[model samples]
Target: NYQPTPEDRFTFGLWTVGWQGRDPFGDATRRALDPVESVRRLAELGAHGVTFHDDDLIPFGSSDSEREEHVKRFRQALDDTGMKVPMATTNLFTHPVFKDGGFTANDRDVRRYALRKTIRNIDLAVELGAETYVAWGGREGAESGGAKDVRDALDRMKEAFDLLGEYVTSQGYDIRFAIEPKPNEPRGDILLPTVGHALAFIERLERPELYGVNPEVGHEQMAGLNFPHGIAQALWAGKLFHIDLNGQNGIKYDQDLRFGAGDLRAAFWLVDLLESAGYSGPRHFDFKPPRTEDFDGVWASAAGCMRNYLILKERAAAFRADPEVQEALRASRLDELARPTAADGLQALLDDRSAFEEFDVDAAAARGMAFERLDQLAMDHLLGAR
Candidate 1:
């Protein structure tokens, strides 16, 4: 059986750890941690990797030399701690220039500027040996009237990524883009608001092979959708390039709670799917510390996310190994239902029209199958009822 530990493929976002707990209603509850300090603390917490947006490590308006100097220092911290940067991203939404949008901005100058910034960040991502570059369009929508035409916005968005894709190929960079979806928050609506939408958009891209998704648990749940199901579809499409692990309740705000905090059952199934699929990407947490938490509490929250995920992962492994659960799955023939032998014989049946005509659809439907019991069995394992 596979065993999971806190150190297994865990990654923390610098923004998650270094967040000063500031909100519109209040000032920062805690002081910001230096980027180097953030890396050191995460490493001390047994994290295997770290991720960041460009602005998280370097200031937004940094000159070329300043950026180089900051990146060098940040790289040194990673080298000193033997930690990896598995992903990096551009902060296109936070600046004033992006009030309209980044890639989908109505202003041509803003759109061009956004692409330029992303291109520079892509170079930094390469320097840090990051494998994935995430583009979360937090400001890629409108709140009220005077919004850009939806079709035009989408076209601009596609063009922006097409440009980036061409740049990556031209520069011979190995990094791939992972579009992170959010239903809404900073804007009333956002483009590519879910994994499904993002996948469809990628299909229209000039380089679909160079793009994928970075689904966030809280982001999906904010739209009252099942996080695991979204991830399953992404994995099924071979587009689960990266992910953001966190917790959130249904249809509420983005809570960004620790993993397994909001819905333990969903988290269990998520870990099960990842384990079964043999996902090799970083299990990155994009949660935030509560406003009431202090500095120690912040670090503890970060560690708590890794620990909780490890526990769920271990539980999922045990669930898969249990004889009773295996027996139930076998009895239910869930695997057969998932990939029916009938499908394998379809071509042959089509060749023989008589066989196709005689297909016993009613008999198949009338069969005494209790698929619902499979759900109960899974619940038993999840709830330790077995």
Candidate 2:
């Protein structure tokens, strides 16, 4: 069992089950998945918070009267359950009314509707004490011609947020905005397709303190990006405020698989990056099971995520404690630091398996080779021959 230290704060959010809709596997009809029961289940499972979408608790295009009632009910549920709605986003992609776009829509009426909807959600967030409002430009894409005026579209999105932010701030609310990036999904292409792209967009708006990037691991992998590298880059820019820890099969399709099952190495890299960046935010699980196994599927999916997170945490700690790795890094130049070579016995033990490299992990272990000793070589080089 991996033990969390007193100061090692870990927060989790359940993203798969909050939406009040028909069960994904047809087990239930159009009914709300008892929000209070869900929160109790999450808390018992060790989650710290819950994420919400505009349509998760109520209908997407609900009337003003309906929205008010929905918000009040949701607020009451959270208070009763003791689970906080700390993060959320607009439901701009999955709705028919937003077929063309939302904030970035060329049609004034659609954009107006989007703004109105967002403001309403913001008000709900305020009432519920939610801390982060995520804005993913889900419909900000151009499938055909006349995409030349994309700049104007982006301008509208930013302006909408700016007004919203100003309004919320004046009301003494502290809901931060997060811009999520997806390379491509519902559309042929997506705006702000990468964490870097999202950061650049925020810079353009000059709201560094109010907005940041919430890079999803699956989304980065879908873009053929190194997931950990993406997180590191965002953290380096001091813009990594939120994260979505889900798994990707490294293919084009968005199969939000169980964490660490698809690419274990990439999962390790992501955890390591988060450790290095000192991130301790809510580790939200945004994934879906294969839909073959009824309720068991959901439990398995959640357990898989917890298992992956715990294993990654263990590996990260082991890596951090390896003195040999540190020595190797200090001995080399900055560019050479990328590879953990130069450690004593690392080169001799490692099979240079680049076409002619012959290496076996069991064979190396039999020879008494381990990462700690390899890391020591680098540490020695930095600290004088030990």
Candidate 3:
């Protein structure tokens, strides 16, 4: 019943389903999947496009001819399936050369190398028809506080973005960069660890409009922060260029769980926020299939991500449409919040003496927000009880 179509705009990273179940404690339990197979299978599942890191499409350090052959075959696969490449990123974290970090590496040569690698990928991303390129600085931090100078690290990061942004502009590429933030994991403390941090950092870039955030659900959840709230803030700032949908229970290692697999309630609200906010981007699934699953299970996991999202979409719409829920929202003064604290301006408020003086603080305090009632109805709708 959860049949998807390209119109659904569902997407998956090639690295996602292609992950071979390798974890810190074990070896690969599954063979690597061919990129050609991924595009076909994903299209059959009704996904609109495939996203990837540069290395995922063409292995790192491949010769010029090798890279061409890889892209030629990959383009052929895309052409056959009528799929698209909606986004692409760099593998700046994996190779041991990035033992320190990329962009912010203390060694000047490494930092320079990182930039060259990233910029080269930018060209490829544009050729592949990717509208958004995500920059996930997974290794741009240190385990010890004294090891990496936080201030200098930020400066290097800024310079990298400025140059990269400048490069895309010069090429007349129709693409924007989306910074992906993670609290910690491979690195003890990743710089720009949250959506808010990324948002703040974007302003420092030479081209603020050229940058935005690609927040991940599990990444924020690992920091014990509200996922949908972050999406709302990103949306408010007009910086939600892309997103990574997955799940995590609380502050823990990045779970990368399927949508609604860890926190169903949060997933539901996330879908509600995206739908209501008109995100209008690919619903990119950035989760890994658990090591416990086999080949068939990987596809099942991928299917579940889309199905859960569609289910949540249906439920959230129903919850919004329900007369009871609407009444509950009004009872909670939810709609009133949108009426603006000062509709006209500060001067308008200054001219009206009663604006503050006559406002009934006591009555406002006494009024029930009725959020609990509204929330429970949300729960009921998700439960199909409404």
Candidate 4:
């Protein structure tokens, strides 16, 4: 079995670690930790890096001087602990100004403000050497009416991204924007509500090359979708910029439970896919400590997420290297079946009447495809039956 180590490239949202367990129904269950202390604690817990929103590391209404001081102190803690910042994002959702939306708001003023804030956050991201800037449009949809026209809203969003991409290029920064999709929470319905939808939207941008999708596990499960399948699609599109590793039950609220807390089977395959594809991005968790947990439990939850992911990674490696699994894949001709058969065929095949006339549909049907066996083999391997 492979051993877990502190050198693993695990990144976490500072918000998760610093959350005070406040919810709509109750008071804060735990005391909030300072940003510097959060960094030190997470680093000591074996995480190699951290991610955050603008407000997560700095207070929302802090003055320019205060912001600078806060960042300097936080940077010092990172330097002392040897932890890195791999991602940064803007908290465009929680602020009342974004009640309508951020970039998609009908009011041009709100949209402009959102863009300005994002640009400023981009500067912070660059300052911190973040490789990815995540844009989770939490309030980017209408709960009821008075919303902008769908087409106009999407156009505005694209315009904002185009401008941002230009700004990044002009600044000569080496960072990519990642769009995190969710079905709904603060809004009734969200645009780009899935990884597939986000990928489609990315194609419409002026600089699609500068944008990618950050598929979140709970978000996909919130839509009653398969998390691993969504990530696999993102990887297939060459746009897997970053990820949010958390857990949630099917088709409900955003649980944001610890990693592998909901479905271990799905988590196993997710790790397997990432390992097989050689994904090198940070495994950043976007979960929160349960409101009932104490301070010790909060830190334990954070450590548990990293530990669970490491265990899954070890299992995934074993799954891939198993002799029986390899035999099953060969028997299924899984790799061979993935290749296109029409490669060498010229227009002559389409132009010839004899080709169609001589085609034997019944004979092809007689050679039955056993897709079920292939699926069962994978299930067995995942279940440790093989």
lDDT of each: 0.88, 0.70, 0.93, 0.86
Candidate number with greatest TM-score: 3
lDDT of the structure predicted as candidate 1: 0.88
Query: Best to worst by lDDT, what's the order?
Result: 3, 1, 4, 2
For residue 54, give model 2's deviation from the true position in Å: 1.5
Point out the higher-scoring one by lDDT: 1 or 4: 1
Q: Which stretches of candidate 2 lie over 4 Å from their true place?
A: 2-15, 18-32, 61-73, 145-148, 331-386
Give TM per candidate: 0.92, 0.79, 0.97, 0.93
Model 3: per-residue lDDT, tens digit, 281-357? 98999999998999789999999999999999999999999999999988988888889888789999898867688
Each candidate's number of clashing pairs is 0, 9, 0, 0
> Worst ten-residue run, lDDT, model 3?
351-360
* Candidates sorted on TM-score, descending: 3, 4, 1, 2
Candidate 4 Cα outliers beyond 4 Å, as residue runs: 1-6, 346-380, 383-386
Task: Give the higher-lDDT candidate: 3 or 4.
Answer: 3
User: Is 3 or 4 the stronger prediction by TM-score?
Assistant: 3
TM-score-best of 1 and 4: 4
Best candidate (score: lDDT): 3
Question: Which pairs of residues collide in model 3?
Answer: none
Error in Å for residue 138 of model 4: 1.0
